[PDB]
Amino acid sequence: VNSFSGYLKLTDNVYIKNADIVEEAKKVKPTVVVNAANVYLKHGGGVAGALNKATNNAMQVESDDYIATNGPLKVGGSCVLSGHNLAKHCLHVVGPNVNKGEDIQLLKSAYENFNQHEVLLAPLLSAGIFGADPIHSLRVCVDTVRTNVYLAVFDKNLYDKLVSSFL
Numbered sequence: 235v236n237s238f239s240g241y242l243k244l245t246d247n248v249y250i251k252n253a254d255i256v257e258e259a260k261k262v263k264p265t266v267v268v269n270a271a272n273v274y275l276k277h278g279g280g281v282a283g284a285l286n287k288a289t290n291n292a293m294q295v296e297s298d299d300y301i302a303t304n305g306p307l308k309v310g311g312s313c314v315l316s317g318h319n320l321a322k323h324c325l326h327v328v329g330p331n332v333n334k335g336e337d338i339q340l341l342k343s344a345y346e347n348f349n350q351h352e353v354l355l356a357p358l359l360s361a362g363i364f365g366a367d368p369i370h371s372l373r374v375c376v377d378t379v380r381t382n383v384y385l386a387v388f389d390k391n392l393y394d395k396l397v398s399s400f401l
């Protein structure tokens with residue numbers, strides 16, 4: 235038993251809620267919150283800009299030191315950093331950005347990072363400003379992630395859609 239509330243159960247291991255991941259994060263203090271990162275860890279907008287703002291820019295300061303030491307992530311890759319005031323850890327995961335021409339096949343590789351963590355609070359990778367179809371993203375999530383994932387879909391119209399079309 236864990237502390238997530240109000241989720242709809244999609245499969246054995248995937249759950250979905252209409253929620254603001256920042257607010258869900260501040261209430262659950264999950265062990266892991268997933269950020270929809272880019273390779274430079276420049277958290278300017280979307281989920282990343284919201285998570286970072288909620289940390290009063292501490293996420294960005296930590297991220298800039300990470301990049302200065304290690305260089306950029308790979309598309310499809312990830313790193314574990316602090317969760318600051320939102321979670322124990324933040325798993326920064328880079329899904330492909332269709333608005334940058336990146337290969338959508340890398341979305342499966344991105345979701346594979348979730349399997350290194352038993353339970354995660356996460357957004358749909360490559361959704362929103364990353365330009366992928368959130369329904370395809372949900373299908374890849376369900377078919378790739380084997381650990382327990384709690385998906386927060388900020389928008390209500392899209393949520394209800396994702397549920398109604400789910401196979």
Ligand SMILES: CC[C@@H](CNc1ncnc2[nH]cnc12)NC(=O)CCC1CCCCC1
Binds near residue numbers: 281
């Ligand atoms: C689907 C991916 C999410 C990712 N963003 C966040 N997800 C969770 N919590 C957040 N807090 C701040 N941002 C988020 N994007 C949206 O819902 C934007 C609206 C839809 C409307 C339909 C077409 C695609 C864009």
